[PDB]
Structure formats: C-alpha cells, structure tokens
Amino acid sequence: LKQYREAAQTAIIIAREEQSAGNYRNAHDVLFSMYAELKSQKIKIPSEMATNLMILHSYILVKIHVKNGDHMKGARMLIRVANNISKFPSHIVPILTSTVIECHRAGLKNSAFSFAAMLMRP
Amino acid sequence: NQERLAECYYMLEDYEGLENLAISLPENHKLLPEIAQMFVRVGMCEQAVTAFLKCSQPKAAVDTCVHLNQWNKAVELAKNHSMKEIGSLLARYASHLLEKNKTLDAIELYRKANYFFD
C-alpha cells in the first residue's frame, strides 16, 4: 500500500515482541530483513527501527565476541546491552551477570562493579 | 538512590521505610552506619542494633544498648561477640543508682541484665 509510516511501526512491534519473548536471534533476523525491505526502496528509516536493530545486533555480536575470547569487544557490547537491559526482559538476570564477568575479564572493573550493584537490587 | 532516600525517610519520620531500606541494602554499605545513627537518635534500639551488626560493628551495637539502657541486649552481645566489658558498666551504673537510693531501679536493671543473683 506504500504507507511506510505504518510498515515501520509494524516492524518495530513485531521485533519488540520477539525480543520480549526471548528469541533475540529470530527478532534480529526479522527486523534486519524488514529494515532491508524498507531500505531497498530508498525510504527514510525511522530512528526507532535503527535503534532497535542496533541494540539487537549488539546483543547478537556479544555471543560472537565472547566466542572468540575477545573480552574487550564483548564487554563493550555487553555494556551497550546492559544500558538497555529493559529491552531484554526475559533475560535481565543472566545477561547482566555475563556482563560483570566480561567486565571483570576486560578490565572494565568499574562497569562491573556498577552492574553488580544494580544486580543486588531486591 | 540510597543516600538521599534515607534522608527523605528520616525527615519524613517514616522509620518503617528506613528499616525497609536498611534491610534491603547489601551486607556492607557506606549507608548502614548512618541509618543506625539515625535510629539511635530517634531511639529505636532494636533496629539500630540490627543495622550496626549488619555493618559488622558490634562495638557500637553494644555501646548503643548501654547508651539506651538496654542492658539485656548489651550483655547478650558481649557474650556473643566476646567483649565482656559490660559487667563493670552494670556494676558502676547500679552503684550510682544505689547512691541515689533508687534500689528498685538497681533491681530492675539486674533483672533486665539477667544478673538475678544481685
């Protein structure tokens, strides 16, 4: 229908629902494909879609950077995720824990202390 | 925010909120001693003692029991944490009370402090 103000909103809703459910890989995949579909027509993609894609892709890259043992890159990406941890509800507790561990490995011990203190909320 | 929240509770005189904040904090913290001081000022011996013991400062936790005249808790904490300096405290406090002819007060303390023989 070429009403691109609603296509972006539907994409955001679908990606956010999949992210909340706990399937971050599937949410990232669908949001990226929808982003590419909107981009292929040379359409101004809203900043909300770009921010969601950036956060999902940062979380996706967390696993890759931890996998190869590069603790600095994974720690930076985990800090970026933890600053938005509300966007990852169903895995708030696990991811944050990983962040601390990574922030302990990479030497970002101040961030590790802050995130662990935020963990010790009731 | 913890440091300002304790001040807001204190000025609001919502001491239940202060107690909840103090029991929600981790085992150690820079704020728990201040909360215990606030409790001591207002006169809540029990909450102050629990807060100080959370800080791991039994010496102050017994100094407040002495200060607030809760000698039962003072003697119990001395037995637990191995201070044993409160016997003289009770002895001379009761001596002063007897010097004021308040023998009944001396009996009351000796009953509170479980010094039943005296």
Side-chain angles (χ1 to χ4, degrees), chain A, chain B residues 1-2 4-58 60-78 80-83 86-98 101-104 106-111 113-118:
Chain A
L1 297 203
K2 298 187 183 180
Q3 43 182 352
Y4 306 116
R5 200 50 58 187
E6 288 80 9
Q9 294 163 356
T10 48
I12 295 161
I13 291 181
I14 299 163
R16 171 195 310 148
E17 285 171 6
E18 281 269 354
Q19 212 186 15
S20 296
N23 295 316
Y24 309 112
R25 182 74 199 169
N26 183 25
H28 165 260
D29 267 4
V30 178
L31 189 50
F32 153 72
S33 73
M34 262 185 198
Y35 182 108
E37 171 57 32
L38 265 170
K39 180 182 188 177
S40 71
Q41 297 298 109
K42 293 309 163 188
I43 306 177
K44 178 179 184 176
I45 277 172
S47 57
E48 187 177 8
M49 261 185 68
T51 296
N52 303 323
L53 189 72
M54 191 255 298
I55 294 181
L56 265 170
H57 178 75
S58 299
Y59 179 67
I60 282 294
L61 287 191
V62 171
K63 166 179 186 177
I64 308 178
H65 288 292
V66 159
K67 151 188 170 186
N68 296 341
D70 199 320
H71 307 121
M72 193 57 155
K73 304 188 177 187
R76 292 297 180 204
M77 287 303 107
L78 271 174
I79 292 181
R80 193 177 283 182
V81 173
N83 281 335
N84 295 303
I85 197 78
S86 186
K87 311 307 186 177
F88 311 76
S90 295
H91 287 108
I92 280 173
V93 175
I95 295 167
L96 270 181
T97 305
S98 306
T99 312
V100 186
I101 311 169
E102 275 296 331
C103 291
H104 182 74
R105 266 179 177 172
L108 317 176
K109 309 174 178 178
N110 186 86
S111 301
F113 164 54
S114 61
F115 285 135
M118 182 179 72
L119 289 175
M120 292 180 183
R121 297 166 186 185
Chain B
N1 196 297
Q2 310 287 345
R4 293 302 282 267
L5 195 43
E7 161 191 357
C8 304
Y9 291 166
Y10 187 80
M11 303 284 314
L12 278 195
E13 297 183 3
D14 189 73
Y15 304 122
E16 168 197 6
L18 269 174
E19 192 178 6
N20 291 341
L21 198 153
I23 65 190
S24 80
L25 290 180
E27 183 272 348
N28 266 28
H29 207 292
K30 324 164 308 306
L31 198 65
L32 295 160
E34 174 57 41
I35 280 176
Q37 304 290 350
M38 272 183 266
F39 278 154
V40 164
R41 297 177 200 294
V42 189
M44 283 74 74
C45 170
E46 159 193 353
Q47 294 80 350
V49 163
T50 51
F52 280 123
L53 291 178
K54 178 169 244 186
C55 311
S56 74
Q57 308 172 220
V62 188
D63 283 20
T64 63
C65 291
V66 162
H67 165 272
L68 281 173
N69 301 113
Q70 308 294 336
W71 298 93
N72 172 30
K73 276 181 194 172
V75 179
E76 194 165 15
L77 298 156
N80 289 20
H81 301 61
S82 309
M83 283 73 74
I86 297 89
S88 55
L89 265 294
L90 270 155
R92 66 185 184 273
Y93 198 103
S95 307
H96 166 221
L97 290 192
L98 293 182
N101 292 318
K102 293 180 181 178
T103 71
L104 320 170
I107 304 164
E108 267 295 329
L109 271 79
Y110 280 152
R111 189 178 83 87
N114 304 320
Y115 269 63
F116 283 104
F117 205 97
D118 304 335

